[PDB]
Design a protein around this ligand. Structure first.
Ligand SMILES: CC(C)(COP(=O)(O)OP(=O)(O)OC[C@H]1O[C@@H](n2cnc3c(N)ncnc32)[C@H](O)[C@@H]1OP(=O)(O)O)[C@@H](O)C(=O)NCCC(=O)NCCS
Lengths: 400, 400
């Protein structure tokens, strides 16, 4: 298919079947970085992402759109033919749904024995009958992994937002699919990858959970965005807004304590000389430290705190609101937010390609395609005639 | 170096320089999947991760440990020699610190023109003098990217937890490094990757931010864990505790409305037949749906609701606490939590390898190594004599 040659993944052919965030995010990252990526949609039912007015202009850029019933008659035949030239196939579904509909890994490999197959599900491709076939979204994966219980305030759990587990899960699928592709180059043999969203999020939530599994206690939740375990770390209110800070280091603690009126705690059994990080659970002065930190920060503007904290080498940042990003100097210098043209000729603003590859940078070469926009070109490219395509369309097995 | 042959990344040589979560997570993931990974630490002090009693047993498993001053004299020479047989080098530091210390990308490529170099920083490798050389922290990246302001409750922002940005940034570096490695295999030319943590997190926070960038409004924060825009989605209370649900789909909405007392809303101009999602602010009955949902869930147990939503194909799950995971049927069936031996002979419990590769699964072959445990074997492997190694040690440039 016609497109510019760019990025580390030029020449790669990637196909995904899935909707909304997780599966499509996995596939579309390949497209940010140069790959030929094909988005499969159902014929009567488009990806529900298309209901959002702006997000998909970002989340479906650089893609080719195919609309095909991949499970019926000529539709299935065209899908399996497509697999013959495909390097990586990503599918998101409820457990082993493809296998239930006749498309097993074995069937895919009969068409391409080198195929990397990434299966993204909520609960895995195997397990128990109770959980394996359950529908999952982000919130379910957070709940089921112990991630949700660690987010929110002391007395109110909540999910991490927006849709955090969907992005972790998609990104993991991209990572694993690339690692599998690497091995194909040596062995000439494909691979199947079982990415369960709850196992993804299980791993992301281990920092303190590992204490629970190994004799210790679990950590409590944050109190108003303050770290549950480390004093002077996390979210604080200044006179004119929010900041984050990380009170870490010997001199940092001593200078900060001088400023806030707690020099007299320094060099005591509770806070000995050379302390570099205050453990709030262990420390009986934890609450006093937070009281005096809050009081000092409350009487100073963000700018004054940043100036002082720079003198003291204390890490901090203003909590930026969305309207402050586009004019921020670092964003401007790095072109972190850019613009591109949609398919219908309108200017769209959003994040540039990330990360920045020095020798082979990504680029935005196409806006989001419409439903079935490239069906005819894709089918022609894999050997269908104009007549064949019209007959698929007339049976309702494809949409152009 | 001696180790079992397994996984998709068998044979790959990866080296990382960094401490704590973000850069080491990127490196260690290669080790989960079969790569030879060398963890560099300083000589007279170690990675600060080691202070944590349990987590490092997970976050540094399957690793080899090198203690070497890579920037000074014969230590720099030994590091640049190591690069000659390294496929991927990952480093986390404050902006272009390696370049300031004398090791530019050009110097690395003089030793290995194929080298994939992943540079992980808070604010990127270039930009403004004000921000580029600032410290990298999870809280700062969330603050600076607009991620933090979206998390939390209506009148209380908070970071996503635990240290969510470090994991996203590390995982991205792994993905990007594997993409660049694919390009090396095609062209023979190495690559330098500039992973700015704030740009990673910017992308993960776009679902609603894209509305702001293109003429619309930014979305509010969740209220007690309920989605800010979609009704029937997020955190709810049953008679005996918390669940999450996602009220999504045509039949799902119909059947749920019937159960909760809103059958009379169906097939009207406000809720047309075939409605798949309730937009809580656009729908005049959004608040009514939440009232009726809350009331129905309150009179039923978690088991009762799970059963009904299984019937209706409505995604839900109990919000699991950490003590509930190990005995959960899906966790048991999939061995999602397993056990292994530490290097000093104790049993450690924690997550298994994820994801599950069918043909070439990962495995746990080694506990976390001690400080400089493999220094002598690594240096010997790249051609240093017994006496050369002792000289490095005497000069304080290496630790064995
Ligand atoms: C997203 C999800 C919950 C939707 O549930 P669903 O039951 O698949 O609902 P859909 O309406 O999307 O699919 C209905 C059928 O159309 C099928 N279908 C998909 N693409 C098709 C195509 N091109 N042609 C014909 N049928 C297709 C689906 O596979 C499904 O078949 P099944 O009922 O035999 O399992 C489900 O795919 C899932 O749990 N996926 C894994 C987790 C995930 O990715 N969640 C989204 C994160 S944002």
């Amino acid at each position: 298919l016609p497109m510019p040659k760019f990025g580390p993944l030029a020449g790669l052919r990637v196909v995904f079947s899935g909707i909304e965030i997780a599966g499509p995010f996995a596939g579309q990252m390949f497209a940010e970085w140069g790959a030929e990526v094909i988005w499969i949609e159902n014929v009567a039912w488009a990806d529900t992402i298309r209901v959002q007015p702006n997000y998909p202009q970002l989340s479906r850029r650089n893609l080719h759109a195919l609309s095909l019933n991949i499970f019926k008659d000529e539709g299935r035949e065209a899908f399996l033919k497509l697999m013959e030239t495909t390097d990586i196939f990503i599918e998101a579904s409820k457990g082993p749904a493809f296998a239930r509909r006749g498309i097993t890994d074995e069937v895919l490999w009969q068409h391409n024995p080198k195929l990397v197959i990434a299966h993204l599900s909520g609960f895995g491709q195997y397990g128990t009958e109770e959980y394996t076939n359950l529908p999952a979204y982000n919130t379910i994966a957070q709940a089921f992994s112990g991630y949700l219980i660690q987010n929110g305030d002391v007395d109110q759990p909540m999910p991490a937002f927006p849709y955090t587990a969907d992005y972790f899960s998609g990104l993991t699928a991209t990572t694993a699919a690339l690692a599998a592709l690497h091995k194909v180059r040596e062995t000439g043999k494909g691979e199947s990858i079982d990415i369960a969203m709850y196992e993804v999020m299980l791993r992301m939530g281990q920092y303190f959970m590992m204490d629970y599994f190994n004799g210790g206690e679990m950590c409590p939740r944050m109190s108003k965005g303050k770290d549950p375990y480390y004093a002077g770390c996390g979210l604080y209110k200044c006179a004119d807004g929010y900041i984050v800070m990380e009170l870490v280091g010997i001199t940092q603690i001593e200078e900060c304590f001088k400023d806030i009126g707690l020099a007299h705690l320094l060099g005591t059994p509770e806070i000995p000389e050379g302390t570099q990080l205050i453990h709030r659970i262990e420390c009986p002065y934890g609450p006093l430290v937070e009281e005096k930190l809050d009081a000092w920060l409350a009487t100073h503007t963000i700018a004054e705190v940043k100036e002082r904290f720079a003198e003291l080498n204390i890490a901090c940042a203003k909590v930026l609101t969305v309207p402050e990003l586009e004019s921020n100097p670092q964003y401007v210098a790095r072109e972190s937010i850019t613009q591109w043209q949609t398919m219908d000729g309108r200017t769209c603003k959003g994040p540039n390609i990330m990360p920045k590859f020095k020798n082979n940078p990504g680029q935005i070469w196409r806006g989001m395609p419409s439903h079935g926009m490239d069906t005819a070109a894709i089918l022609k490219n894999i050997g269908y005639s104009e007549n064949d395509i019209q007959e698929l369309v007339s049976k309702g097995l494809a949409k152009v």
